[PDB]
Design a protein around this ligand. Sequence first.
Ligand SMILES: *[C@H]1O[C@H](CO[C@H]2O[C@@H](C)[C@@H](O)[C@@H](O)[C@@H]2O)[C@@H](O[C@H]2O[C@H](CO)[C@@H](O[C@@H]3O[C@H](CO[C@H]4O[C@H](CO)[C@@H](O)[C@H](O)[C@@H]4O[C@@H]4O[C@H](CO)[C@@H](O)[C@H](O)[C@H]4NC(C)=O)[C@@H](O)[C@H](O[C@H]4O[C@H](CO)[C@@H](O)[C@H](O)[C@@H]4O[C@@H]4O[C@H](CO)[C@@H](O)[C@H](O)[C@H]4NC(C)=O)[C@@H]3O)[C@H](O)[C@H]2NC(C)=O)[C@H](O)[C@H]1NC(C)=O
Ligand SMILES: *[C@H]1O[C@H](CO[C@H]2O[C@@H](C)[C@@H](O)[C@@H](O)[C@@H]2O)[C@@H](O[C@@H]2O[C@H](CO)[C@@H](O[C@@H]3O[C@H](CO[C@H]4O[C@H](CO)[C@@H](O)[C@H](O)[C@@H]4O[C@H]4O[C@H](CO)[C@@H](O[C@@H]5O[C@H](CO)[C@H](O)[C@H](O)[C@H]5O)[C@H](O)[C@H]4NC(C)=O)[C@@H](O)[C@H](O[C@@H]4O[C@H](CO)[C@@H](O)[C@H](O)[C@@H]4O)[C@@H]3O)[C@H](O)[C@H]2NC(C)=O)[C@H](O)[C@H]1NC(C)=O
Lengths: 167, 213, 210
Amino acid sequence: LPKAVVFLEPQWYSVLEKDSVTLKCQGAYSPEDNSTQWFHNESLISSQASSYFIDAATVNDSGEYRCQTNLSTLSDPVQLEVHIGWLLLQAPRWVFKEEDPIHLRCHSWKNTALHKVTYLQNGKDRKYFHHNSDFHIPKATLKDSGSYFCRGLVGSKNVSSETVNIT
Amino acid sequence: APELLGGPSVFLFPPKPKDTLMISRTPEVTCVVVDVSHEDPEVKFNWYVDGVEVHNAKTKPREEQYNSTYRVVSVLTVLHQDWLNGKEYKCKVSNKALPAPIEKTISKAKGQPREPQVYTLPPSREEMTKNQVSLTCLVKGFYPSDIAVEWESNGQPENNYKTTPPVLDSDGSFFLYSKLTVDKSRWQQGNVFSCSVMHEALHNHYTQKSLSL
Amino acid sequence: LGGPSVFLFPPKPKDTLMISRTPEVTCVVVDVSHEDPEVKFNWYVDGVEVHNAKTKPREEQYNSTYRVVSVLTVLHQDWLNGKEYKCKVSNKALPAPIEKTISKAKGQPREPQVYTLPPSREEMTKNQVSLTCLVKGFYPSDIAVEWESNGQPENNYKTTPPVLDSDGSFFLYSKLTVDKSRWQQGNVFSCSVMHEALHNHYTQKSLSLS
Ligand SMILES: *[C@H]1O[C@H](CO[C@H]2O[C@@H](C)[C@@H](O)[C@@H](O)[C@@H]2O)[C@@H](O[C@H]2O[C@H](CO)[C@@H](O[C@@H]3O[C@H](CO[C@H]4O[C@H](CO)[C@@H](O)[C@H](O)[C@@H]4O[C@@H]4O[C@H](CO)[C@@H](O)[C@H](O)[C@H]4NC(C)=O)[C@@H](O)[C@H](O[C@H]4O[C@H](CO)[C@@H](O)[C@H](O)[C@@H]4O[C@@H]4O[C@H](CO)[C@@H](O)[C@H](O)[C@H]4NC(C)=O)[C@@H]3O)[C@H](O)[C@H]2NC(C)=O)[C@H](O)[C@H]1NC(C)=O
Ligand SMILES: *[C@H]1O[C@H](CO[C@H]2O[C@@H](C)[C@@H](O)[C@@H](O)[C@@H]2O)[C@@H](O[C@@H]2O[C@H](CO)[C@@H](O[C@@H]3O[C@H](CO[C@H]4O[C@H](CO)[C@@H](O)[C@H](O)[C@@H]4O[C@H]4O[C@H](CO)[C@@H](O[C@@H]5O[C@H](CO)[C@H](O)[C@H](O)[C@H]5O)[C@H](O)[C@H]4NC(C)=O)[C@@H](O)[C@H](O[C@@H]4O[C@H](CO)[C@@H](O)[C@H](O)[C@@H]4O)[C@@H]3O)[C@H](O)[C@H]2NC(C)=O)[C@H](O)[C@H]1NC(C)=O
């Protein structure tokens, strides 16, 4: 028997509260009764949805998410990191090195409108933006070893994102 | 209408110097909150007296619309000594329209408290040409900047007068002037007046000085 | 919003009085991207374009953003007569140009009355002495006051900022200190007052013992 696999939608592993997440348990089921089992930190939860939908993401919805089915071994695990804030720096992984444009998204709580956004590394402004927008990098470079965090203007008040380590 | 993308701000104001100094006056610190979401009003506050909360009594809202948005305020009757002693009053506003709560913390300025000095100055001869002289009383060498001032003539108080706010003095102390507008006569006819100065470093949180010809 | 911002500054008050001084309203533009650093300034006085009237620009880099500065020199009269100065900045990332006008405070002015008020005996105890000089009934708040003691610019002397009176004018003191000895053993001084009134926007009043 194969293992079920859990996918995220959207593909952001770190998210803000109020955000919407969806964990889908891809795979095959048994033609006779096909229910799915979801595991939060190796524990259950209202077991069914082939797609457990996390509608209003909060901190607790955080942890390891795994899924199973009448014809699959326990899925591999998937981590959902949920934080409290106005902004959040996103990216599939922070451990980067070569051939891959560093994708950095500055996200705003409830997706409010963020403007005059800066992207920083080591308390130094590395990139400015009139209107909020992702921060990519042409060709991946070993010269991207630092601590990042974005911030901008939600309306007319300032907001910042917790810092992160782009290793 | 007013779009509000952004955490309705919070402002906290201390209490009036007199109210703090007069043991018969109730000094109340206020946590004003503006930009309250039409579609998400009323907030929960949290006052932390130097450390611990104080839900009991010490509370007082009463919503009130405005420009095109609401405005809630939290009054918190203080403790003369406390305040006048350094108690750091914290307020924490929480609207379901913010990602989290906002914490404003205000407290009596820190520094060697200083006892003022009130001097009353008679208008300048060159002003006699006017139809109202100006009774001027100074108030130097004190700290903090908090203080009140008034004018006693005899049995009953004055109105026609203005005062400049404290000004950091060359010696880390403070000072100010309060000019009194009386009529040419009233002064000339030799009447007497009193600069009423209320500050903390006062023998009884009160001093005085009369001004006559 | 979101884009470059614009701030307009006025001339220095003292610069607007001494004709020997050169006034200038400044129009700063911030949040100028490195993508569209092109900033087009258009200035307008009382409605017409000043064109150049000798206006000057050029750019610099701060945050990781740009800052441009055009600067129009203001003609004393003009300024003082209340002419309005408009600045129209327009960037590419700017949906529609930003206009900022600035102008000297509206309304008829008032001749500031100055009176020197000698210290008080009550204070004739301490070692230093509080000399004072109030100025009242002047408009607007555009005023500076120094203290000529001996054809010099004395040190320790504080002045308060104007305060609105009941009239519509303002007033402000200016306690000037000096060791006792000095004043004590008979000496003189004067506070300098500058407003857009005074004969030559200037007047001085003396104060000593006796
Ligand atoms: C619609 O709703 C409101 C009101 O509508 C309209 O009302 C008319 C009358 C008009 O004048 C406008 O007010 C308005 O269009 C509107 O405004 C509200 O939000 C703004 C900010 O967005 C608030 O602005 C703050 O004001 C305080 C001062 O507030 C008091 O004092 C002023 C004196 O000018 C009064 O006008 C107020 O009514 C307040 O009254 C006080 O009430 C107390 C109760 O007892 C009393 O104790 C006080 O004595 C009394 N005052 C009086 C009447 O004498 C300022 O302090 C704020 O400044 C600080 O923040 C700004 C940033 O905005 C900084 O630039 C500035 O430096 C200050 O920052 C502080 O600096 C110090 C150092 O100096 C630090 O120590 C502090 O820590 C730091 N604080 C910070 C930022 O952390 C600020 O200007 C305004 O007061 C609000 N009005 C109300 C209801 O009070 C609102 O914006 C509008 N909606 C929309 C579309 O936006
Ligand atoms: C990134 O960096 C940019 C540059 O900021 C840099 O500042 C210096 C100090 C550095 O150390 C760092 O701090 C930083 O790298 C940011 O630009 C700033 O943007 C903000 C808004 O986002 C602006 O804030 C408003 O500022 C105005 C006016 O501010 C005056 O005072 C400050 C005090 O330091 C000065 O920095 C500033 O230059 C302004 O005055 C000064 O400059 C004038 C023009 O040069 C002088 O006038 C001229 O003087 C000449 C001689 O000196 C001559 O006499 C001439 O005739 C005369 O015109 C002036 O003399 C001098 N100081 C004074 C005043 O005497 C405020 O009024 C305004 O306040 C309110 O704001 C709210 C909301 O905006 C509004 O509701 C109110 O109505 C008011 O408007 C703001 O505080 C700030 O001015 C910008 N700085 C610069 C470079 O001007 C940029 O924003 C940053 N990027 C981001 C967004 O992340």
